[PDB]
Amino acid sequence: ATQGVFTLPANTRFGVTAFANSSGTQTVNVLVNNETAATFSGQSTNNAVIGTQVLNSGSSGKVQVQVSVNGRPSDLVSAQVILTNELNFALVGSEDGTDNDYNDAVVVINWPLG
Amino acid sequence: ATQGVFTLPANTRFGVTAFANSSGTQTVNVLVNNETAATFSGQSTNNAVIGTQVLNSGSSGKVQVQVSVNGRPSDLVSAQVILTNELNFALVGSEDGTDNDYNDAVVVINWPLG
Amino acid sequence: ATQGVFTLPANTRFGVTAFANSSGTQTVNVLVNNETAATFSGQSTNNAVIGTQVLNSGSSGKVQVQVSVNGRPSDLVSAQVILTNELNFALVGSEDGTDNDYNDAVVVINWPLG
Amino acid sequence: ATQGVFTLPANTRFGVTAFANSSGTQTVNVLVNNETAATFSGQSTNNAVIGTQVLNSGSSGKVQVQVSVNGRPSDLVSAQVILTNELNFALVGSEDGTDNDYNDAVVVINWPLG
Ligand SMILES: C[C@@H]1O[C@@H](NC(=O)c2ccccc2)[C@@H](O)[C@H](O)[C@@H]1O
Ligand SMILES: C[C@@H]1O[C@@H](NC(=O)c2ccccc2)[C@@H](O)[C@H](O)[C@@H]1O
Ligand SMILES: C[C@@H]1O[C@@H](NC(=O)c2ccccc2)[C@@H](O)[C@H](O)[C@@H]1O
Ligand SMILES: C[C@@H]1O[C@@H](NC(=O)c2ccccc2)[C@@H](O)[C@H](O)[C@@H]1O
Ligand SMILES: [Ca+2]
Ligand SMILES: [Ca+2]
Ligand SMILES: [Ca+2]
Ligand SMILES: [Ca+2]
Ligand SMILES: [Ca+2]
């Protein structure tokens, strides 16, 4: 099944934050309006926050997360959770290696903001 | 129901990150084994990270999040999600006011690391 | 926080199923736009499916689950999860007692159908 | 990423319930101890329950859901959710066709029971 693609409410501000847990340099691209809107890169085995940004989901609401290591796409796993019918998280893990920890790049999207 | 309490695997490193979306200064306490191990304080209405730390779950694995504003405990909402039977998130929202957006402090716990 | 209240897409068919895990007879009420649409009841310590029904979310999309035992309201816990940006579950547990297993009545709402 | 595989606590009873939403007759296999422990079969486009059973997760705790239609394996999507640090759901959707509704067989695993 397709992973790393989320339909947000249209025209909504959201937070996106990426963490790294791998020997390899992680590249995270976040797409809105089907165009890259934020990019984060870095190597950490200590859960570094390789970047955090506020973005706008735009007229379609479509947000896509892509992860690669030196151009090689990582395998993604994702889901969305809603708490008290109001607070939304879109969650992504990614695997760059063989161990299947799926924490090599972790991405968390949250909305609403403010 | 009790919210903001999670049983992690024992003696495991985990990441904890807090975001703020409120006029009020948020104070996040992270307890391991019923003692405060990390505290984050900050103010933002734009999802700013007010703290990030790597902790160890210790012999019990018991991790608790508490949030206060101006010494008043916030109401919490929480859940844990596991992706591909490997990647764990414990998610907390909190409400310091009347709008029930539950984003006033948002806390993301993730494991494993490395 | 409020629990057991879900906003579904409007005018959508959804499934609702209830399971029992208690010495007490559970009564599960499912409200659509604040009116009882389904009522299930039974007594099992072995996960009996005490009712299952297909309902329509109608114009508001508001679905609420309430549980009573001993004519006393049970305490609820809930969340919504979305898989592959398409498959939705609204999950409810309830506690009628003191052991806080929150499985005394379990309710699962799923959509889309067909 | 692997889907439909869950690590439960060892030697623990769990419920498994399967629903159908497809023209195709669904075959749901639940493996424990890497051996088939239960098989459900049926057809519905109205979310009918095609099977419900209580199984034991065994010494490993490894539970695996597989779905097939006329001997062709369906593509799975899954996740686990924990509410109030006590109530666990393992959720599976499956796709046997081209519309990617992932509801053709839906499987809900819940524990603990009793
Ligand atoms: C330190 C190590 O770094 C990566 N592993 C590798 O890059 C790797 C690639 C190929 C073969 C073996 C290891 C990660 O996938 C792994 O989870 C771990 O964080
Ligand atoms: C900016 C504003 O800040 C807080 N609101 C208050 O401090 C507040 C003040 C007065 C009355 C009610 C609430 C938050 O709870 C609210 O979600 C919003 O983020
Ligand atoms: C079998 C038992 O049934 C209820 N418990 C009681 O009825 C109860 C009886 C006596 C004292 C306290 C509670 C449940 O809350 C409990 O989770 C368990 O399923
Ligand atoms: C009624 C219909 O039944 C199946 N569809 C098919 O059997 C199908 C498979 C391949 C091509 C066309 C149809 C399902 O995948 C679909 O979601 C819908 O529930
Ligand atoms: Ca890895
Ligand atoms: Ca890793
Ligand atoms: Ca608020
Ligand atoms: Ca707020
Ligand atoms: Ca109970």
Ligand SMILES: [Ca+2]
């Ligand atoms: Ca019980």
Ligand SMILES: [Ca+2]
């Ligand atoms: Ca289908």
Ligand SMILES: [Ca+2]
């Ligand atoms: Ca279908």
